Amino acid sequence: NRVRVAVTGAAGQIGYALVFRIASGQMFGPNTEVELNLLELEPALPSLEGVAMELDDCAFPLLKRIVCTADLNKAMDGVNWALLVGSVPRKQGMERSDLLQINGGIFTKQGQAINDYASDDVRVFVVGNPCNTNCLIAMNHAKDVPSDRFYAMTTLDELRARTQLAKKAGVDITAVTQMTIWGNHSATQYPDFYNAKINGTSAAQVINDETWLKETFVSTVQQRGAAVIKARGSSSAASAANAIITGVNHLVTDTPAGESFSMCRRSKGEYGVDEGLIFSFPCRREHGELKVVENLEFNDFGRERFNTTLNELRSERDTVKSLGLLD
Amino acid sequence: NRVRVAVTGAAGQIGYALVFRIASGQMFGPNTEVELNLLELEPALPSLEGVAMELDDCAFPLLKRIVCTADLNKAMDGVNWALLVGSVPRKQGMERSDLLQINGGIFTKQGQAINDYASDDVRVFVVGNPCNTNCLIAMNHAKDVPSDRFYAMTTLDELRARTQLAKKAGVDITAVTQMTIWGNHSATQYPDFYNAKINGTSAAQVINDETWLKETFVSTVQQRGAAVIKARGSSSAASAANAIITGVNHLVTDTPAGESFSMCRRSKGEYGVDEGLIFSFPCRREHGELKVVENLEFNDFGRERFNTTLNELRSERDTVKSLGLLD
């Protein structure tokens, strides 16, 4: 039980908040050794070496090897998990298609390096934005990697929604279960307050404030990242890193009875989601297999929010297809 | 099964890397609920509210309360641990005297606030530099708190030394035991490679390069903080946060057989160290009580290093006494 993990953008704020908790055992468990393969762009390699010195200076018993490189093939060589954290943010003068085009190029290459160099059992966990469509592009460039190995992260959205529900109901965080973020990791995400539970009962019914749930709770969750930037003065790196730890942990440990978690994955057609889209679904891990929770119901309000986010993901797919990013 | 912890400087880089790992249960254990009292200077309060938003967005089951304040007395009210991280760093033009003076005034007030507001069982763990003497000053301004409640951190020095020994000997980190950093958290510290062990044998007998041990090894540990800054560009925040996790954990859990850990504490006279000085000693926690490891031996080389760092701590004490910081 040793896991080799690539982390891209490894000298950035998320990576800096992430790698120490990984090495401490929190992602894969207290008896699983870890090898960290850390990738950066060439100009950031000196900073990365400083990060590696700090990892060494923690004397982590589980940390068995550190690789620091700007060579993508070296970073992916024999990895069992690829955490695709790094991406290109929107910059001055970019159009939306420009952002998809730039990140598409990057994730085409990362998918192909994963295909040609990662371990046969590799799983891929995409964080950098736009993460659903970046994941779609990487998946489509890894022909030899099964498509059910590709994930994108809505865990941060989910944990933010869980706290907002627990705060509003004045209950302990552990009284919230089955929090589902449907669709895209974006402002069109649907945080489903009907199927989420508070003390085993529909959160909508416990909170009993339709106005607050539809007009404050949903927008608060959708806009929470922007609110942290405004308050703290930089990105929400530590809570993002926590969400990576939590989401990968969800994929490698069986889900306690009564719970479920949000995860973007390749749709097999569940809930009418176009086959092959990367889409956030409710999931459970049972007997070591990932399953989509079936038979959750919607009202008209929910079908509306569901179709809005599905249509955004369709539009992004059609756009990157048009740019020649899907072969 | 609930601990209330004050963290000063809580929006700084060390605090930002530290509070999430505390909230996840790594400092006090998986079954110990935590209340975080976070202190900052007034201009940094808005940024601290952003840190609290991120803590909330982690949905930590153990995190039961967050307080954000610039009121020192509010921060210390009823706390069981006071993690004194915040301090003024050395900047352009500052001498050692100025660093001792500026931070001395801060820790006078922090000690007095712990004395008058913290819980009866409070323990104090000083990180901000100069940490030994800042701890001495706080302890001297907390007349009602027993002197054996005051600690300062050489844990980062110690873990850095462990990794250098393991790297040189080509052994896993867990093969190194009983790493003692004697004296001051400063460049006069004595990392004792004679009493440290590799697979149970004196490191000085396993690593046969006597010149490497006396020149390269000792200097590398003493100058490691500067080297990380040169490499990363910023301070070693995440590894310092890890050392705080590890050091406090050493003080709340019994030490495994065959190990020991470095801890600055109030001298009772052990090893000829003047009563009342805060000095880094080899320690074990046995059946819930902290004990100094006694009867460790020195050669002539080690005696000189020991005397150098003792005299530096005497010099620092005399300086802040001269400044009027001990009343």
Rounded Cα distance between B186 and A187, Å, is 50
Q: By three-state DSSP, how is residue A60 classified?
A: coil
Q: Is B162 on the interface with A (CB under 8 A)?
A: yes
Binding residues of A for substrate: 90, 96, 129, 160
Taking every pair of Cα atoms in chain A, the longest distance, rounded to a whole number of angstroms, is: 55
CB contact under 8 A, B57 and A227: no
Q: Is B173 on the interface with A (CB under 8 A)?
A: yes
Give the pair of three-digit tokens for residue A70. Answer: 């700007």
Q: Is A231 on the interface with B (CB under 8 A)?
A: yes
Distance of residue A247 Cα from the nearest chain B Cα, in angstroms: 12
Known catalytic membership, residue B287: no
Q: Is B54 on the interface with A (CB under 8 A)?
A: yes
Ramachandran class of A245: left when φ > 0, alpha when ψ lies in -120 to 50, beta otherwise: alpha
B15 annotated ligand binder: yes
Binding residues of A: 9-15, 90, 96, 103, 110, 127-129, 160
Beta carbon pairs, A and B, within 8 Å: 132
CB contact under 8 A, B54 and A232: yes
One-letter identity of residue A309: T
The reported resolution of this PDB entry, expressed in Å, is 1.9
> Strand pairing of B63-69 and B33-39?
parallel
Distance of residue B161 Cα from the nearest chain A Cα, in angstroms: 8
Rounded Cα distance between A11 and A51, Å, is 7
Q: Which residues contact B62 (CB under 8 A, 6 or more apart)?
A: B23, B24, B25, B30, B32, B33, B34
- The CB density around residue A250, as the number of other CB atoms within 10 Å, is 22
- Based on its alpha-carbon atoms, the radius of gyration of chain B, rounded to whole angstroms, reads 19
Ramachandran class of B244: left when φ > 0, alpha when ψ lies in -120 to 50, beta otherwise: alpha
Give the closest of B20, B46, B228 to A53, CB-based.
B228
Rounded Cα distance between B291 and B282, Å, is 9
CB contact under 8 A, B232 and A47: yes
Bridge partners, A163 (sequence order) = none
Rounded Cα distance between A113 and A124, Å, is 12
Tell me the technique behind this structure.
X-ray
A141, A185, A250, A287: the catalytic one is A185
At residue A129's C-alpha, the angle toward residues B48 and A264, to 5°, is 105
CATH topology of domain B1-152: Rossmann fold (3.40.50)
Bridge partners, A300 (sequence order) = none
**CA terminus-to-terminus distance, chain A:** 36
Give the closest of A17, A59, A160 to B17, CB-based.
A17
Domain boundaries, chain B: 1-152, 153-327
What residues of B are in contact with residue A59 (Cβ under 8 Å)? 159, 162-163, 166, 173, 176
- The CB density around residue B31, as the number of other CB atoms within 10 Å, is 8
> Please, what is the angle between helix A13-23 and helix B13-23, to 10°?
40
- For domain A153-327, give the CATH number: 3.90.110.10
Residue whose structure tokens are 């820790």: B107
Binding residues of A for NAD(+): 9-15, 103, 110, 127-129
Q: Is B241 on the interface with A (CB under 8 A)?
A: yes
What residues of B are in contact with residue A224 (Cβ under 8 Å)? 53, 57
Q: Are residues B147 and B274 in contact, defined by beta-carbon separation less than 8 angstroms?
A: no
